[PDB]
């Protein structure tokens, strides 16, 4: 798996309230989180499809 898949969920440094998906390595699932729109990390996907393609099905 890419190393970004092991990064923690990170809501970022902004004040927006946006739906994103993160890979939860311990659960082997792409899960929902709230993102503030800036200052996150790479474990941050708009679609479940992209998180699964990148992190689950490697």
Swiss-Prot record:
**Compartments in which it is found:** Secreted
Disulfide bond residue pairs = 5-55, 30-51
Q: What is its main location?
A: secreted
Q: Which residues carry this modification: Threonine amide?
A: 58
Keyword tags: Amidation, Disulfide bond, Ion channel impairing toxin, Neurotoxin, Potassium channel impairing toxin, Protease inhibitor, Secreted, Serine protease inhibitor, Signal, Toxin, Voltage-gated potassium channel impairing toxin
Q: Give the family, as the similarity comment puts it.
A: Belongs to the venom Kunitz-type family.
Function statement: Blocks specifically voltage-activated potassium channels (Kv) of the Shaker family (IC(50)=1.33 nM).
Name of the protein in its database record = Kunitz-type conkunitzin-S1
Q: What organism is the protein native to?
A: Conus striatus
């Amino acid at each position: 798996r890419p190393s970004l898949c092991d990064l923690p969920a990170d809501s970022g440094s902004g004040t927006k309230a946006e739906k994103r998906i993160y890979y939860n390595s311990a659960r082997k699932q792409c899960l929902r989180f709230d993102y503030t729109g800036q200052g996150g990390n790479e474990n941050n996907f708009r679609r479940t499809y992209d998180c699964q393609d990148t992190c689950l099905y490697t």
